């Protein structure tokens, strides 16, 4: 169908592969941030997940917000007391870009618990736009995932939801996930979901599309598998809670595979 844009999807995938390299945050930025840590970032993203749930925002919106945050933190030092202001502004911008009905600014001020003023939120929006040079149309794990989904035979809802779940988990932990591109995390997540649910593997058809093989995916796959196995123990749990919902076919209740046989 034209909904899957047969005449353009190859051009689009090629374009997103180019853009993800240009829109990539700096892998080592956290060590260069005097006052914030991977763990503070994890707390922030987990919160954003909850916000997204509260306002019924698209997953894509959440992925964009995290991209904006990581790019911003790649060039601007931020004190721990301002990290949540950056995150709120990012989520507001992502909503305006991606949502049919974004929440009002008032609602974003409200979910910060009056920690910040409307004037602060709006001034930060401007700074983020200036720092990002208005470059908001960034590729996300989700944009690659939905294309990879078209290669299932047949489509399986648990596979799709589990892949999105695994993709979301990776947003929380800058170490190690800042080192992998969205298209690669998406490929790892898709293979892991497919394998967990159906026993099948990264299909030849996607080797053809992406040039990626299980060998090239191995490093990310080994990390994603650990993350999946440790998810119930992780300090942050908002994503697991989110994906217990029937909307996502309760995939976070599925058991990870003990071994990958890669």
């Amino acid at each position: 169908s034209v909904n899957e844009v047969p005449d353009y999807h190859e051009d689009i995938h090629t374009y997103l592969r180019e853009m993800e390299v240009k829109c990539k945050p700096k892998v080592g930025y956290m060590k260069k941030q005097p006052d914030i840590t991977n763990s503070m970032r994890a707390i922030l993203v987990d919160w954003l997940v909850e916000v997204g749930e509260e306002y019924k925002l698209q997953n894509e919106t959440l992925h964009l917000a995290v991209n904006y945050i990581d790019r911003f933190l790649s060039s601007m030092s931020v004190l721990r007391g301002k990290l949540q202001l950056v995150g709120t502004a990012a989520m507001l911008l992502a909503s305006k870009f991606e949502e049919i009905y974004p929440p009002e600014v008032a609602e974003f001020v409200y979910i910060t618990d009056d920690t910040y003023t409307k004037k602060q939120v709006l001034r930060m929006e401007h700074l983020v736009l200036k720092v990002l040079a208005f470059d908001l149309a960034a590729p996300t794990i989700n944009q690659f995932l939905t294309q990879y989904f078209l290669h299932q035979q047949p489509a399986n809802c648990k596979v799709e939801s589990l892949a999105m779940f695994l993709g979301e988990l990776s947003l929380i932990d800058a170490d190690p996930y800042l080192k992998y591109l969205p298209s690669v995390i998406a490929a790892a997540a898709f293979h892991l979901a497919l394998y967990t649910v159906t026993g099948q593997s990264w299909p030849e058809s996607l080797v053809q599309k992406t040039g990626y093989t299980l060998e090239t995916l191995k490093p990310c796959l080994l990390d994603l598998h650990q993350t999946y196995l440790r998810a119930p123990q992780h300090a942050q749990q908002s994503i697991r809670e989110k994906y217990k919902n029937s909307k996502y076919h309760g995939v976070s209740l599925l058991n990870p595979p003990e071994t990958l046989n890669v």
Binding site: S1, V2, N3, E4, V5, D7, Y8, H9, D11, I12, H13, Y15, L16, M19, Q58, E60, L92, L93, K96, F97, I100, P102, E104, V105, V121, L122, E125, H126, L129, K130, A133, F134, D135, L136, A137, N142, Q143, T146, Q147, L150
Partner: protein
């Protein structure tokens, strides 16, 4: 870039938020259009989409965003200057008509610009002659990307209230959950017909009137022509069932190749509707060139 280098010439248009001036760069000489965006909800989402999408879209047939000047109180978008919109050009060509070589040149260029948008996962969603800009050298360009959207593959549900009514595709009118690149093609097909006749093809005054106008021209669609149509949210079995017109009666001055192309751009079924990319190769364009406009702008 900075506001002190620009000398304003005159006002040339308006929208939101929302005035557009013709200006000139005092140092380089370059003539530009300045779209002023006045800044309680922060930067408008329409401006955010327009700027972020236009920064990626560099193509001879897409209006060029040169710069963004972002004071705390004001946001100025600096575009390359283009002399006229296609609507004004059609009005100025009344009683004479637009020469076929120019209609063909303009359609071919519009299709290049659109194919480029769709290849970069952008839906324009407001193609109409008012938003197509021409210069004195024969170029025509897509402009006004405030209603545009970056899409995903496959598409999700996006805003339902899109496309100016006269140019709005039947799948939007019938409330389909999803719409795609085919909606911009429907619009170009209406624009194609309008360039030949100098009047809107489907000038409805409401959604239902708009649908019935389309149906009386192309026939009321049924399951044969458009699988799924009777299942759509806003399809009603009480719709009058009009016969399809002989297509040669829709735009009588159009030759066989023209009619072939128009008919593929106005196909009911979005899955069958021609793509911009495929349309570039249509025999209608076998002799296409790029002449300047026949009238002073």
């Amino acid at each position: 870039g900075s506001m002190e280098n620009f000398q304003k010439v005159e006002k040339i248009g308006e929208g939101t938020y929302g005035v557009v001036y013709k200006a000139r760069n005092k140092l380089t000489g370059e003539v530009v259009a300045l779209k002023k965006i006045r800044l309680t909800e922060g930067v408008p989402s329409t401006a955010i989409r327009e700027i972020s999408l236009l920064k990626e879209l560099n193509h001879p047939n897409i209006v060029k965003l040169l710069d963004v000047i972002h004071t705390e109180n004001k946001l100025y978008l600096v575009f390359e200057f283009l002399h006229q919109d296609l609507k004004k050009f059609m009005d100025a060509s009344a009683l004479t008509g637009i020469p076929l070589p120019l209609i063909k040149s303009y359609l071919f260029q519009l299709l290049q610009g659109l194919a480029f948008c769709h290849s970069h996962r952008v839906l324009h969603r407001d193609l109409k002659p008012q938003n197509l800009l021409i210069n004195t050298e024969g170029a025509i360009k897509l402009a006004d990307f405030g209603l545009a959207r970056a899409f995903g593959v496959p598409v999700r549900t996006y805003t339902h209230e899109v496309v100016t009514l006269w140019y709005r595709a039947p799948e939007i009118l019938l409330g389909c959950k999803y719409y795609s690149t085919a909606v911009d093609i429907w619009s170009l097909g209406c624009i194609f017909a309008e360039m030949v006749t100098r009047r809107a093809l489907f000038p409805g005054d409401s959604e239902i009137d708009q649908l019935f106008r389309i149906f009386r021209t192309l026939g009321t669609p049924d399951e044969v022509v458009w699988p799924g149509v009777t299942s759509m949210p806003d399809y009603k079995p009480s719709f009058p069932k009009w016969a399809r017109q002989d297509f040669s009666k829709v735009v009588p001055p159009l030759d066989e190749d023209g009619r072939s192309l128009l008919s593929q751009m106005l196909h009911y079924d979005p899955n069958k509707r021609i793509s911009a990319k495929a349309a570039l190769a249509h025999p209608f364009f076998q002799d296409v060139t790029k002449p300047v406009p026949h009238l002073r702008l």
